[PDB]
Structures are given as C-alpha cells and as structure tokens.
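re the bet — no i am not wrong, look at it urself. input seq straight from the record:
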Amino acid sequence: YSDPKEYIESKYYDALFSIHTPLAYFVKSNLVRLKNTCRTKYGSDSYKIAYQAMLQKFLLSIVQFKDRHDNRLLLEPFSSPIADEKRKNCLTKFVIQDENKNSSTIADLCVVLKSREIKLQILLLLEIIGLNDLDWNFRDFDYCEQLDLYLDRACILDILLSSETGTIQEHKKNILDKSKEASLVGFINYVLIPYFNKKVPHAVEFIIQKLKGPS
C-alpha cells in the first residue's frame, strides 16, 4: 500500500481481525513504518501532527465503541474494501469454514474482537499521548481521560469473562491466560512495557496500577 492512509487502514484492520497475530507487530512494525513515511513526507518539523491525524481516524469515542460492540457492527460489511476484506477473512476462517461452527461461535468471536480492539485503542492512545508530551499527567491523575475509560472497559471485560461458565473458543480462553499476549498481563509484559515504557513510562505505570493492583 503506497498511500499511507490505505496502509494504516490495512494494518489497523489486519491487527484487529487477524486474531492469532501479535499486537507487538502492529506496534514495532506497522506504526513505526507509518511514522517514518510521515517523517519523510511532511518533514521533521511538523510530521507529528499528520501522524497523529492518521491514527486518530481509528480512535473510537467511548460512545462509538459501545455502539460498534453492543450491536456487533464488526460482523457487517465495511463500505471501505480494505477493512472489509479483513472482516471477511476473519469470518471465513472462524464462522464459515470451521467444521465446529456452533451456537456460540458468534458471541465468542464478538468478545475476542472486543477485547482485542480495546487493546488497539489503548495503543493508539498511548502513541498519541507520547506525541503530545502528555505523559507527565499520569504522575498524579481529553486523551488521558479516554485512556482511563478504556482501561475500565478492559478490566471489566476481563472480570465478566472470568465470572462466566471451534478454534475461536481457544482465542477466547487465551484472554484470561497470563502467558498469552491476548491477556491483560501478557499485553502489559509483551507490548506495553517493551514498546512504551521508554517514552510514556508514567502512562505505563498508571496502566499497571489500574489493571493489577499496586502489588
């Protein structure tokens, strides 16, 4: 994808719908390449602004997120064919071609995608926070407010699943396995800390407190 807008649309939706793929690749590879391209195209003076605008496109207000997920919008055709292809590939893999497709395939797919997109939104936010030098805010605690709300949704989702009892069923169970990137603990240890702790360390610390205790 030559056009940067198409590149990031492609990578955001590949990251979301392509559920077996680590988010570490979205961060260390996709976001970095996009940022480079903006650096080159817009110049070192002013690229942060354009980079931010490109990311912000995929940022979901808490109201928009609730609609996307309560009404299972992710099952529906996207008018953009780049996003839509990734949706279809996900459905082909987990709802059409899987022999065990059953009565709880859809609900599990929707919760795996919801858990996954919460993480993606936290990532977008952390990236924007770093760009705008907003980390100091997390010393003693609106993008910062938005991060906070998504962290609430992350751990509530986690608790909801934990309070409850096909290959999508394994992905769902991975959300609560600490050894996996799909879990909050894994998302902290394999993504947040390695790729965000050097910039944004106060935000990372805040995330750890919010999601796990003070320890």
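see?? Residues 1-215 form a domain with the Methane Monooxygenase Hydroxylase; Chain G, domain 1 fold (CATH 1.20.58.2130). told u. also DSSP finds ten helices and no strands in the chain. so pay up
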